[PDB]
Enzyme design. Structure first.
Site, mmCIF file in Angstrom:
data_model
loop_
_atom_site.group_PDB
_atom_site.id
_atom_site.type_symbol
_atom_site.label_atom_id
_atom_site.label_comp_id
_atom_site.label_asym_id
_atom_site.label_seq_id
_atom_site.Cartn_x
_atom_site.Cartn_y
_atom_site.Cartn_z
ATOM 1 N N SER A 193 0.876 -1.181 0.000
ATOM 2 C CA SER A 193 0.000 0.000 0.000
ATOM 3 C C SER A 193 0.910 1.227 0.000
ATOM 4 O O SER A 193 1.747 1.283 -0.911
ATOM 5 C CB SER A 193 -0.980 -0.076 1.130
ATOM 6 O OG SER A 193 -2.105 0.733 0.852
ATOM 7 N N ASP A 208 -10.073 -4.499 -4.568
ATOM 8 C CA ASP A 208 -9.445 -3.545 -3.617
ATOM 9 C C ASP A 208 -10.352 -2.319 -3.500
ATOM 10 O O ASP A 208 -10.616 -1.669 -4.539
ATOM 11 C CB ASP A 208 -8.033 -3.198 -4.082
ATOM 12 C CG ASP A 208 -7.168 -2.566 -3.012
ATOM 13 O OD1 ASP A 208 -7.693 -1.756 -2.204
ATOM 14 O OD2 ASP A 208 -5.980 -2.870 -3.017
ATOM 15 N N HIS A 246 -7.825 -5.743 -0.301
ATOM 16 C CA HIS A 246 -6.591 -4.932 -0.130
ATOM 17 C C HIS A 246 -5.477 -5.731 0.576
ATOM 18 O O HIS A 246 -4.284 -5.453 0.307
ATOM 19 C CB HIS A 246 -6.962 -3.625 0.575
ATOM 20 C CG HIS A 246 -5.822 -2.666 0.636
ATOM 21 N ND1 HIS A 246 -5.250 -2.146 -0.517
ATOM 22 C CD2 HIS A 246 -5.158 -2.137 1.691
ATOM 23 C CE1 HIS A 246 -4.281 -1.317 -0.173
ATOM 24 N NE2 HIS A 246 -4.188 -1.313 1.187
#
Length: 262
Positions: A131, A177, A208
């Site tokens: 991320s 996601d 995610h």
């Protein structure tokens, strides 16, 4: 300038939870430019091995990304997993801290007392992360083109233009996601890079956290991560097949690559 360690891999053997080499780990005593670190190293590899620094996402810690420690280290790498100075650090700070972790690994390589003295080729390094840590990994590649490879997961950054990047870059993407949507983060970042060997692996109905410790695709994701790092960090063309392959699997919703020569 190839650096072949270990046996000729097979799909079945790269899908296994562990490679040929025994893995030990220790906690970094005095972290230099980051919050905390666990180092994973192979006990008897046959030669010097490259180092990979792995950074978590916003609010996350070493647990999110920890599995990559043994998964890569057992195939002949030194892996440092970090906690950031603050769980709320942004991508540029995450990149500085990623590079500081690599610097302190080059340091513990010169440190007679450290269990990784002499174990590291310091001219063979890679970056990974989740991320905002994947965004930082792409920032590390853009700023340090001598890095041998980058394999971020569910990448997040406020800018998608990574056209400068010349480092071989594999992006794990998670189909469903909702945090960093593929259509607006991972794919646009991937589409910006025209000067590099690159890949885009997207996990069928993935959230995610689809590449994180305990995911339901550690077989495919782990195979692709090790393959990509062995191909590009060691220039080991035994892994060209696995690195560039379009996996025939229903576990994958999308696959793209460019400049991935077989």
């Amino acid at each position: 300038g190839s650096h072949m360690r270990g046996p000729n891999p097979t799909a079945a053997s790269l899908e296994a939870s562990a490679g040929p080499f025994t893995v030990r780990s220790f906690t970094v005593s005095r972290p230099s430019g980051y919050g905390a670190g666990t180092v994973y190293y192979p006990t008897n590899a046959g030669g010097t091995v490259g180092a990979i620094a792995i950074v978590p996402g916003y609010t996350a810690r070493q647990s999110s990304i920890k599995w990559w420690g043994p998964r890569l280290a057992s195939h002949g790498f030194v892996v440092i997993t970090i906690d950031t100075n603050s769980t709320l650090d942004q991508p540029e700070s995450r990149s500085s801290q990623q590079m500081a972790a690599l610097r302190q690994v080059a340091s513990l390589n010169g440190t007679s007392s450290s269990p990784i003295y002499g174990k590291v080729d310091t001219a063979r390094m890679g970056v990974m992360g989740w991320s905002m840590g994947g965004g930082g990994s792409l920032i590390s590649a853009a700023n340090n083109p001598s890095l041998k490879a980058a394999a971020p997961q569910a990448p997040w950054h406020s800018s998608t233009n990574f056209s400068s990047v010349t480092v071989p870059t594999l992006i794990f993407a998670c189909e469903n996601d909702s945090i960093a949507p593929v259509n607006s983060s991972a794919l646009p970042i991937y589409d910006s890079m025209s000067r590099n060997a690159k890949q885009f692996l997207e996990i069928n109905g993935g959230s995610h956290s689809c590449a994180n410790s305990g995911n339901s695709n550690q077989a495919l994701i782990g195979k692709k991560g090790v393959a990509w790092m062995k191909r590009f960090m060691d220039n080991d063309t035994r892994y060209s097949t696995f690195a560039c392959e379009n996996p025939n699997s229903t576990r994958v919703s999308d696959f793209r690559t460019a400049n991935c020569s077989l």
